[PDB]
Design a binder for this molecule. Structure first.
Ligand SMILES: *[C@@H]1O[C@H](CO[C@@H]2O[C@@H](C)[C@@H](O)[C@@H](O)[C@@H]2O)[C@@H](O[C@@H]2O[C@H](CO)[C@@H](O)[C@H](O)[C@H]2NC(C)=O)[C@H](O)[C@H]1NC(C)=O
Ligand SMILES: *[C@@H]1O[C@H](CO[C@@H]2O[C@@H](C)[C@@H](O)[C@@H](O)[C@@H]2O)[C@@H](O[C@@H]2O[C@H](CO)[C@@H](O)[C@H](O)[C@H]2NC(C)=O)[C@H](O)[C@H]1NC(C)=O
Ligand SMILES: *[C@@H]1O[C@H](CO[C@@H]2O[C@@H](C)[C@@H](O)[C@@H](O)[C@@H]2O)[C@@H](O[C@@H]2O[C@H](CO)[C@@H](O)[C@H](O)[C@H]2NC(C)=O)[C@H](O)[C@H]1NC(C)=O
Ligand SMILES: COCCN(C[C@@H]1CCCN(Cc2ccccc2)C1)S(=O)(=O)c1ccc2ccccc2c1
Ligand SMILES: *[C@@H]1O[C@H](CO[C@@H]2O[C@@H](C)[C@@H](O)[C@@H](O)[C@@H]2O)[C@@H](O)[C@H](O)[C@H]1NC(C)=O
Ligand SMILES: *[C@@H]1O[C@H](CO[C@@H]2O[C@@H](C)[C@@H](O)[C@@H](O)[C@@H]2O)[C@@H](O)[C@H](O)[C@H]1NC(C)=O
Ligand SMILES: CC(=O)N[C@H]1[C@H]([C@H](O)[C@H](O)CO)O[C@@](O)(C(=O)O)C[C@@H]1O
Ligand SMILES: *[C@@H]1O[C@H](CO)[C@@H](O)[C@H](O)[C@H]1NC(C)=O
Ligand SMILES: [Cl-]
Length: 526
């Protein structure tokens, strides 16, 4: 029940899962609380304790604004933090199989939330099912988000940027130093993450200081080359300065600006984060990763293009309707409570919302590419077009490009297209296979027969869980036993991918070929 770690003993707790047992250590601290003079700095090392730390409940989530767009609605509130917010939030969680494994592969989860939100204690991130079913160890950590995790004054150690990424990296280090005492294998560590968590995973593939801290990587609906994932050094300075003005902290000595921000209460930094950008969109990332000269030594597109990244296997994928979620967070004519049949003029207004700083010609060119109808009379033509615009631009085409460029250097890559709409999905049917709604399948929640999932969804989750665990253990996401479709490597020439659904699991080629040539080759010019 008690494990001796390098910094002290921790006590866990037994859980009953599927007529078996999983041992959970929830809320192990992995860094000095980043409080007081430590706000905005890289995370400092933890000094030992002599007692027994009680890791029996999730710890505080990091400070963050909350999505209040749909109070009482499970489809949005399932993503909101479910422990107290606090600056004292640098904790991690460990689920280990019972009986204690001898040398188990480790899966480390990095949550998303646009780098402004998220917490590892969400119900859909519960590691106990993977530990029970596949006898892997699951680790997840809280890392700082928003300005408190990514405020950037480049070169200045008082606020260097990328602190939340260094939070993640310090937790990977904790697993290297400590997971063998839990029965884990530090030489067999796979990172997995979704959305900004997947963008985070991809940046660890680029960061030389993370290279020795993991083996393989899984990227679910995200990568660093997505247009929302990396803040420019220009915007980062303008945003840090605007935050200073907003809080009466404008100074000329930049270090004195940080000292002033260190005396504001967390809630007043949070309230001014929104307005540091003049025209925001539903995908705005106020404070995110930057090229800091430390974690990130050059523009990541250059590093990707020139093969400067960890050479290992990757698993990458996207969902069929990545873009629809964002339409109900600002696009005119849209509502989760009706079928959102919009007109051409609403479509055009919708592009102004998603591409506010883009030239008139740029917006026309999106319209031109996405309105060549196979039928001009379908009432939902425009509703679907805007969704595909948002999802192709922001998730699908960047993930396909990352996979192509990464595989060109000789590593096995595997790409999936997830197209199952959850039977339990609280959002309306027109929104489809939404961003974030593969996660519960990856974590094995449909394996729990009590929870109203269909039988077909148990089978699909069961096969996904097996493929993810085989990728982490062996670098190869096959299900070898139940006459399953074999998953081929993704090569830049043939570009084969695997579709994931309850019906027919098929091999297909060149996902969104025509749409992505527009986003990837032409649109960057406008
Ligand atoms: C636990 O297992 C490791 C081997 O891990 C495997 O090899 C990795 C390279 C990676 O591909 C993982 O996914 C694999 O599961 C053992 O590591 C060995 O350690 C000895 C130490 O003397 C070393 O000489 C060997 O070269 C290591 N093997 C490899 C393949 O590098 C480790 O000893 C095992 N520990 C326990 C307690 O079982
Ligand atoms: C960079 O920052 C300036 C300042 O932003 C304004 O003040 C901040 C404190 C914050 O409250 C923002 O919401 C404000 O917009 C931006 O310049 C402003 O731009 C808006 C609209 O473009 C304009 O109405 C204001 O008059 C401008 N104010 C000043 C002082 O110039 C600027 O757009 C930001 N972005 C870039 C790329 O420079
Ligand atoms: C779908 O709903 C949107 C959103 O309107 C709100 O939600 C509805 C479910 C209902 O509760 C309305 O009373 C709410 O206003 C509708 O978009 C609005 O349309 C009106 C006129 O068409 C326009 O003046 C508003 O600005 C629109 N609001 C927004 C936020 O864009 C839309 O018309 C509905 N579509 C249908 C019923 O097909
Ligand atoms: C208080 O925070 C306001 C801003 N964000 C809220 C999210 C906006 C999108 C919807 N999320 C809920 C949700 C619904 C449906 C399916 C999944 C998820 C809430 S955010 O900071 O979290 C954010 C920012 C920029 C991102 C860019 C790319 C992808 C995700 C992003 C999230
Ligand atoms: C940490 O927890 C210790 C033990 O808690 C008790 O025993 C275990 C087996 C569980 O059954 C738990 O629910 C019980 O409450 C306490 O004795 C100790 O005081 C705790 N330490 C602190 C600092 O709170
Ligand atoms: C594989 O299928 C199991 C149920 O099917 C039965 O068992 C397999 C091994 C075959 O012999 C088949 O003819 C049987 O009908 C599931 O219980 C099991 O979880 C599945 N495994 C995976 C990884 O999906
Ligand atoms: C955010 C925060 O610091 N919460 C703390 C809570 C609350 O202060 C009280 O339960 C009242 O809400 O108290 C603890 O003793 C607990 O019960 O686990 C420690 C925990 O850290
Ligand atoms: C700014 O302040 C710091 C400490 O408060 C000091 O070390 C530094 O020299 C100052 N620089 C300027 C340009 O005032
Ligand atoms: Cl390693």
């Amino acid at each position: 029940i008690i494990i001796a770690t390098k910094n002290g003993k921790v006590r866990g707790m037994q859980l009953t899962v599927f007529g078996g047992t999983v041992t959970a250590f929830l809320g192990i601290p992995y860094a000095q609380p980043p409080l007081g003079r430590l706000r905005f700095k890289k995370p400092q090392s933890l000094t030992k304790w002599s007692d027994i730390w009680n890791a029996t409940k999730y710890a505080n989530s990091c400070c963050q604004n909350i999505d209040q767009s749909f109070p009482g609605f499970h489809g949005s509130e399932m993503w909101n933090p479910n422990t107290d917010l606090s600056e004292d939030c640098l904790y991690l969680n460990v689920w280990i199989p019972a009986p204690k494994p001898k040398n188990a592969t480790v899966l480390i989860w990095i949550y998303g939330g646009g780098f402004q939100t998220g917490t590892s204690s969400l119900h859909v991130y519960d590691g106990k099912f993977l530990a029970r079913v596949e006898r892997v160890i699951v680790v997840s950590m809280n890392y700082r988000v928003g300005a408190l995790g990514f405020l950037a004054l480049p070169g200045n150690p008082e606020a260097p940027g990328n602190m939340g990424l260094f939070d993640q990296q310090l937790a990977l280090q904790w697993v290297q130093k400590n997971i063998a005492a839990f029965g884990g294998n530090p030489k067999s560590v796979t990172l997995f993450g979704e959305s900004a968590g997947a963008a985070s995973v991809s940046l660890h593939l680029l960061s030389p200081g993370s290279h020795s801290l993991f083996t393989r990587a899984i990227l679910q609906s995200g990568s660093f080359n997505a247009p929302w994932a990396v803040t420019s050094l220009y915007e980062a300075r303008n945003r840090t300065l605007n935050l200073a003005k907003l809080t009466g902290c404008s100074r000329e000595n930049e270090t004195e600006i940080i000292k002033c921000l260190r005396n504001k209460d967390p809630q007043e930094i949070l309230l001014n984060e929104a307005f540091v950008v003049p025209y925001g969109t539903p995908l705005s990332v106020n404070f995110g990763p930057t090229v800091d000269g430390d974690f990130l030594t050059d523009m990541p597109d250059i590093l990707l293009e020139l093969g400067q990244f960890k050479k290992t296997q990757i698993l990458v994928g996207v969902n069929k309707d990545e873009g629809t979620a964002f339409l109900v967070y600002g696009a005119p004519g849209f509502s989760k409570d009706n079928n959102s049949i919009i007109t051409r003029k609403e479509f055009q207004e919708g592009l102004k919302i998603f591409f506010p700083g883009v030239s008139e010609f740029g917006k026309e060119s999106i319209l031109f590419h996405y309105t060549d109808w196979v039928d001009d009379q379908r009432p939902e033509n425009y509703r679907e077009a805007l969704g595909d615009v948002v999802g192709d631009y922001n998730f699908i085409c960047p993930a396909l490009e990352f996979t192509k460029k990464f595989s060109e250097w000789g590593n096995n890559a595997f790409f999936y297209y997830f197209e199952h709409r959850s039977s339990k999905l609280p959002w309306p049917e027109w929104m489809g296979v939404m961003h974030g709604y593969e996660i519960e399948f990856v974590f094995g929640l449909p394996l729990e027969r009590r929870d109203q999932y269909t039988k077909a969804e148990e089978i699909l989750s069961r096969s996904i869980v097996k493929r993810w665990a085989n990728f982490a253990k062996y670098g190869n996401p096959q299900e070898t036993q139940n006459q399953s479709t074999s998953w081929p490597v993704f090569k830049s020439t043939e570009q084969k991918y695997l579709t994931l659904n309850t019906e027919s699991t098929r091999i297909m080629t060149k996902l969104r070929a025509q749409q992505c040539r527009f986003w990837t080759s032409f649109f960057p010019k406008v």
